[PDB]
């Protein structure tokens, strides 16, 4: 009673050392009621996951952490309103009205007082203010199953990090002044990789909210479309494993699982429609197989890499690339031709390793 009347924050710690755990939790729940910010309430419910009740507290932390991410992007919109228009303005002068600075501050003012449920967080905030990333987190927490809606969210997230392909404004060579940040082909990939990996880390192996084959097939197509018009000078910032390493290095997706998601991407997708795109995705696939050959350790793995299906895919991929390469060896330039000739010698070595790991069974 004395601490609950004078120091409520010492009160729950004393009750916890007295092993009165359910009373410490009932003081901490009343901190999370009475508290003035969202931060105090996350701390108080986090203690109710260091002490049924635990799962209710962990759900309140879960909603409150996405509710903080909604507040942060609303204050970013208030601080940087010139960017939150200029990233969108590129394709049309359709000035859809910039959000009411009173209503955003009323939203923030209420988001900082009380935790909301997942459907109120989705509807009146995340969907209202076009927060597709925070909408996708709410779909994961809520186990929402509309695979088409999730693919549209993933597309709109990829098409928020990739800047749209610059149209033919004129070479009026006297424009000396403007430090308008030329985002590198590195820097676009660096932002997009971070956007994919850091969302994947909370979700995987949820194939509904992290649809790996779609994220690959659209991400590689969007970096292909962005890079196609670039100079061969900028097509030297692009890592051939830009997405494929980070999905292993951070998201912990096995290189064996990635190899057949890339076989599915090449077999199912619109990659068969254009030579330059089929050369691109087949190059990523063979650099992903080059990663896998450096991770293969056991006799069991060597005994899988020598399977008929893997060997026959590698020989089909080499035959396909080698056919298209000699179709284009009359139109390509004398660096890019050599770039593809030095790739072919890797693919022929990769097929030789799938064959040596096969006949490592006659001894």
């Amino acid at each position: 009673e004395f601490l609950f009347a004078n120091d409520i924050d010492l009160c729950w710690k004393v009750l916890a050392k007295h092993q009165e755990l359910l009373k410490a939790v009932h003081v901490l729940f009343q901190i999370a009621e009475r508290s003035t910010t969202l931060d105090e309430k996350i701390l108080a419910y986090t203690n109710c996951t260091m002490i049924d009740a635990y799962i209710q507290a962990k759900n309140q932390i879960t909603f409150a952490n996405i509710q903080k991410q909604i507040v942060l992007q609303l204050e970013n919109y208030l601080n940087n309103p010139n960017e939150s228009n200029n990233r969108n303005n590129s394709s049309n002068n359709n000035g859809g009205q910039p959000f009411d600075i009173n209503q955003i501050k009323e939203s923030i003012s209420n988001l900082n007082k009380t935790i909301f449920d997942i459907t109120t967080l989705f509807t009146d905030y995340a969907r209202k203010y076009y927060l597709h990333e925070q909408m996708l987190y709410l779909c994961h927490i809520g186990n929402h199953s509309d695979q088409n809606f999730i693919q549209i969210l993933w597309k709109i997230i990829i098409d928020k990090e990739i800047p749209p392909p610059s149209s033919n404004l004129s070479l009026d060579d006297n424009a000396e002044n403007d430090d308008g940040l030329k985002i590198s082909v590195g820097g676009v990939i660096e932002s997009l990789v971070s956007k994919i990996s850091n969302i994947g880390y909370d979700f995987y192996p949820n194939e509904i909210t992290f649809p790996v084959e779609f994220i690959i097939n659209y991400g590689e197509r969007a970096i292909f479309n962005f890079s196609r018009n670039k100079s061969e000078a900028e097509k030297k910032e692009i890592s051939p494993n830009w997405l494929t390493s980070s999905l292993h290095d951070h998201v912990k997706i096995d290189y064996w699982i990635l190899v057949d998601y890339y076989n599915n991407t090449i077999e199912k997708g619109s990659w068969k429609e254009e030579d330059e795109s089929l050369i691109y995705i087949t190059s990523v696939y063979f650099y992903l197989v080059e990663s896998l050959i450096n991770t293969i350790q056991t006799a069991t793995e060597r005994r899988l890499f020598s399977s008929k299906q893997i060997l026959q895919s590698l020989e089909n991929r080499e035959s396909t690339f080698k056919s298209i390469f000699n179709r284009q060896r009359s139109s390509l330039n004398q660096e890019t031709i050599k770039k593809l000739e030095q790739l072919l010698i890797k693919f022929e070595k990769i097929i030789s390793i799938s064959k040596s790991f096969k006949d490592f069974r006659g001894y």
């Binding site: 879960t62 997942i118 989705f122 597709h132 987190y137 809520g142 186990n143 929402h144 549209i152």
Partner: peptide, 25 residues
């Protein structure tokens, strides 16, 4: 994030398009 006792997000997304999710109308 998954918990076995989250509230399911019982929304009807079947009327959303790439247009209605990209535009300010």
């Amino acid at each position: 994030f998954i918990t076995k006792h989250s509230k399911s997000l019982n929304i009807n997304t079947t009327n959303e398009t790439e247009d209605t999710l990209r535009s300010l109308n």
